[PDB]
Design an enzyme around this catalytic site. Structure first.
Site, PDB file in Angstrom:
ATOM      1  N   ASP A  52      44.229  50.812  -8.867  1.00  0.00           N
ATOM      2  CA  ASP A  52      44.405  51.600  -7.620  1.00  0.00           C
ATOM      3  C   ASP A  52      45.186  50.804  -6.580  1.00  0.00           C
ATOM      4  O   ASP A  52      44.853  50.819  -5.393  1.00  0.00           O
ATOM      5  CB  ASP A  52      43.074  52.096  -7.050  1.00  0.00           C
TER       6      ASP A  52
ATOM      7  N   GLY B 189      37.142  52.587   8.885  1.00  0.00           N
ATOM      8  CA  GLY B 189      37.755  53.296   7.765  1.00  0.00           C
ATOM      9  C   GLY B 189      36.858  53.473   6.558  1.00  0.00           C
ATOM     10  O   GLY B 189      35.654  53.248   6.632  1.00  0.00           O
TER      11      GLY B 189
ATOM     12  N   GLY C 112      36.852  53.490   1.897  1.00  0.00           N
ATOM     13  CA  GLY C 112      37.454  53.162   0.614  1.00  0.00           C
ATOM     14  C   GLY C 112      37.369  54.405  -0.247  1.00  0.00           C
ATOM     15  O   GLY C 112      37.080  55.494   0.267  1.00  0.00           O
ATOM     16  N   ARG C 113      37.600  54.265  -1.560  1.00  0.00           N
ATOM     17  CA  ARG C 113      37.470  55.391  -2.489  1.00  0.00           C
ATOM     18  C   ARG C 113      36.012  55.887  -2.430  1.00  0.00           C
ATOM     19  O   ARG C 113      35.752  57.085  -2.329  1.00  0.00           O
ATOM     20  CB  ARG C 113      37.832  54.939  -3.911  1.00  0.00           C
TER      21      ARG C 113
ATOM     22  N   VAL D 266      33.557  51.804   5.649  1.00  0.00           N
ATOM     23  CA  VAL D 266      33.777  50.432   6.123  1.00  0.00           C
ATOM     24  C   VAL D 266      33.492  50.277   7.615  1.00  0.00           C
ATOM     25  O   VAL D 266      33.970  51.059   8.442  1.00  0.00           O
ATOM     26  CB  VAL D 266      35.174  49.881   5.735  1.00  0.00           C
TER      27      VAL D 266
END
Length: 306
Positions: free
Chosen positions: A137, A16, A18-19, A23
């Site tokens: 966030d 995946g 993040g902002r 990852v």
């Protein structure tokens, strides 16, 4: 050496993003680690998140375990790495889509998220002092589920730190940063007083209330529960703009709906009441993370959890 470093880590699988950064699941001396990779042009985002992770006295069971900030030159370009603990269950959003939880499971998830946020929000005074921190966030995608059923908060790229003596914030923050769906009313309508650190703490509270709604839907009692939904699934498109969010949250003054079956269980009644009290349009009216932690601890003891 004894310390974990980038050169000794082998990437195995993309897990995946993040902002900022991508990852990967890595392997360090046979052990699984999470590795967030940034390019040279994302140095400021990498540096800022490494800075937050290295804050004195930050470590807590409900905050993602930091391992290292490093560089890895492959011979052509340099990658900037942020190494942390790996959690097999992934994030709360993924876990809640896959599974339903028991009353115990729900209280464990809610309490550990509330404990993590209260630790983040609270200043620890002393020689090895920890400044108060606001996440900016918080969402189910930024909370990771551990193997023991507890949570930890991650993705600190947008967080702000407070100096209580001089009453200053460590960075000059921009308006309307974060995930549009979880943005507090005062963020959506730009009325937030960004020179007051307490404003960021109160905005995190609103977002936590939305996450508690996500958990409670999955709390199965007698095999009855709601299907997984994001907050405002019934009111805004899948990728909503700030204007679409502001018209629902600030103008029409709607909040995620509290199902009638949550009234038939004490744990769900306590959760429903916390949610409403996180959702006031005015931040100064919202509960604090410490008060939420205290309430959920009392509820956890009453039901004999863990």
């Amino acid at each position: 050496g004894h310390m974990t470093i980038a050169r000794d880590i082998v990437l195995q699988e993309s897990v995946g993003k993040g902002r900022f950064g991508e990852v990967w699941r890595g392997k360090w001396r046979g052990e699984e680690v999470a590795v967030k990779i940034f390019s040279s042009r994302e140095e400021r985002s990498w540096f800022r998140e490494a800075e937050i992770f290295q804050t004195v006295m930050l470590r807590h069971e409900n905050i993602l375990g930091f391992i290292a900030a490093d560089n890895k030159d492959n011979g052509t370009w340099t990658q900037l790495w942020l190494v942390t603990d790996f959690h097999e269950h992934g994030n709360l959003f993924d876990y809640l889509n896959r599974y339903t939880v028991t009353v115990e499971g729900m209280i464990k998830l809610a309490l550990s998220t509330a404990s993590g946020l209260a630790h983040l929000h609270m200043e620890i005074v002393g020689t090895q002092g920890k400044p108060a921190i606001a996440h900016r966030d918080l969402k189910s995608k930024n909370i990771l589920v551990k193997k023991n059923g507890t949570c930890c908060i991650c993705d600190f790229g947008l967080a702000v730190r407070h100096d209580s003596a001089t009453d200053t914030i460590d960075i000059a923050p921009n308006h309307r940063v974060g995930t549009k769906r979880y943005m507090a009313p005062e963020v959506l309508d730009d009325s937030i007083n960004m020179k007051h650190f307490e404003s960021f703490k109160r905005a995190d509270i609103y977002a936590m209330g939305l996450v508690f709604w996500e958990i409670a839907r999955r709390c199965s009692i007698g095999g009855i529960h709601e299907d997984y939904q994001l907050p405002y699934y019934d009111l805004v498109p899948s990728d909503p703009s700030v204007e679409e969010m502001r018209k629902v949250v600030c103008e029409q003054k709607l909040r995620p709906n509290i199902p009638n079956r949550w009234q038939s269980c004490e744990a769900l009644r306590v959760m429903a009441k916390i949610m409403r009290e996180c959702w006031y349009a005015n931040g100064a009216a919202r509960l604090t993370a410490l008060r939420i932690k205290k309430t959920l601890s009392q509820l956890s003891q009453q039901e004999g959890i863990k």
